[PDB]
Amino acid sequence: PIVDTGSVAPLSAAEKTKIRSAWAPVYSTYETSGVDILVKFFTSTPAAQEFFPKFKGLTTADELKKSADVRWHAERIINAVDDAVASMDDTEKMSMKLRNLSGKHAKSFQVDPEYFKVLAAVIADTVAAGDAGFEKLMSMICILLRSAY
Numbered sequence: 698p699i700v701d702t703g704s705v706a707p708l709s710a711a712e713k714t715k716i717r718s719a720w721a722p723v724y725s726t727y728e729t730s731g732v733d734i735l736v737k738f739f740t741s742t743p744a745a746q747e748f749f750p751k752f753k754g755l756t757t758a759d760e761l762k763k764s765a766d767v768r769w770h771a772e773r774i775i776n777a778v779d780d781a782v783a784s785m786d787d788t789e790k791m792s793m794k795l796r797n798l799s800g801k802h803a804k805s806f807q808v809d810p811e812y813f814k815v816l817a818a819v820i821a822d823t824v825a826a827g828d829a830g831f832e833k834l835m836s837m838i839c840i841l842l843r844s845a846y
């Protein structure tokens with residue numbers, strides 16, 4: 698499972714390899730996959746949607762699915778994960794951008810951080826359900842997201 702504390706053991710070449718092949722298709726169909734992830738997130742975690750002003754009034758899966766607002770936002774989420782994927786070998790680059798995102802989330806949007814690991818789990822389920830390699834990358838992501846709190 699995905700954790701947002703402690704430290705993560707380094708990825709092995711096998712992990713890196715599978716993360717990359719599983720990520721590919723999700724990224725290339727971002728306009729579709731991105732929406733799916735958000736719909737899934739908000740229907741199972743309704744508390745979380747309140748932290749999103751732009752999505753006020755979208756009360757159904759169908760409404761979420763068809764809102765352009767959700768689509769544009771979702772692409773920014775995919776692009777950020779994609780940045781992490783692309784940077785697995787360069788801890789200094791990876792970290793830098795995530796630390797930045799962390800600061801924005803705590804001081805700018807002021808979100809409750811308990812949800813980072815919940816969203817990250819919807820992403821892992823979408824990309825490759827139960828893959829241990831993918832869950833580690835997602836855990837590194839969550840740790841870093843919590844860094845500015």
Ligand code: HEM
Nearest residue numbers: 745748749773774777778801806808809812813816817838
């Ligand atoms: C996997 C974890 C997540 C990633 C990769 C992520 C990524 C992002 C990105 C890339 C942005 C845009 C930053 C910018 O405009 O410069 C953003 C904004 C935002 N995020 Fe996250 N996020 C994550 C989790 C969450 C969660 C769980 C919440 C709610 C609890 C949240 C709430 C927000 C809000 C409210 C905004 C601003 C929306 C707006 O007004 O445009 N994020 N996020």
Ligand SMILES: [C-]#N
Nearest residue numbers: 770773774816
């Ligand atoms: C931010 N989702």
